[PDB]
Design a protein around this ligand. Structure first.
Ligand code: HEM
Length: 153
C-alpha cells in the first residue's frame, strides 16, 4: 500500500508526462523492444520493425504508446483503487495478447528509465522509489488476476 506522500510523488511526475504523452510512449516502447526483444515479437502489428530508426518513424507505434500510457495514467490516478481498470487489461493481456507478468516488469523498467531521462528534477530517488512501488502494485494486482485465470505460470 502506497502512502499518500508516495502517491503525490507518483502523480507529480505523471503530470509532467501528460504534456507529451506520445513522446513518452515512443521512448518507452522503443526502450522495451530494444532491451527485451522477445517483447516485440508479441506485437504482430510491430514485428516488421528491425531498427530503432524504423521504430521512431512508425506512427502506428506512436499511437499505441499513447494507448498504453493513457491506460496507465488512468490506473495511477486511482491511487490503488484501480480494480475496474485492471480487470479488463489483465483479462486481455493474459488471455488474448499472451503477455507474461515478467514482460510487465520489463515495461515498468522502461517507464522508470524514460521518466528519469525526461524529468530528473521531479524524479529523484524518493519519486523513483514511489513510482517503483506504484508499478509493483500494478503488477501484483494484475498477477492475481492472471492467477485466477490460470496464467500466472
Ligand atoms: C503498462 C503496461 C501496459 C498497459 C497499460 C497496456 C495497455 C494496453 C491497452 C490499453 C491495449 C489496448 C486494449 C486491450 O487490448 O486491452 C493494449 C494492447 C496490447 N498490448 Fe498492452 N499494455 C501494457 C503492457 C504490455 C506489454 C508489456 C506487452 C507486450 C510485451 C503488451 C502487448 C499488447 C498487445 C500485443 C496488444 C494488442 C496490440 C494490437 O495488436 O493492437 N502490452 N495494451
Amino acid at each position: 500500500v502506497l502512502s499518500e506522500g508516495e502517491w503525490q510523488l507518483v502523480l507529480h511526475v505523471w503530470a509532467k508526462v501528460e504534456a507529451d504523452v506520445a513522446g513518452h510512449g515512443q521512448d518507452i516502447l522503443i526502450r522495451l523492444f530494444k532491451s527485451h526483444p522477445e517483447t516485440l515479437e508479441k506485437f504482430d502489428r510491430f514485428k516488421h520493425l528491425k531498427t530503432e530508426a524504423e521504430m521512431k518513424a512508425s506512427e502506428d507505434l506512436k499511437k499505441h504508446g499513447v494507448t498504453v500510457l493513457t491506460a496507465l495514467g488512468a490506473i495511477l490516478k486511482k491511487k490503488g483503487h484501480h480494480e475496474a481498470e485492471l480487470k479488463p487489461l489483465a483479462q486481455s493481456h493474459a488471455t488474448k495478447h499472451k503477455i507474461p507478468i515478467k514482460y510487465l516488469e520489463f515495461i515498468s523498467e522502461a517507464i522508470i528509465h524514460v521518466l528519469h531521462s525526461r524529468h530528473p528534477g521531479d524524479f529523484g530517488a524518493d519519486a523513483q522509489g514511489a513510482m517503483n512501488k506504484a508499478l509493483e502494485l500494478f503488477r501484483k494486482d494484475i498477477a492475481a488476476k492472471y492467477k485466477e485465470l490460470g496464467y500466472q505460470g
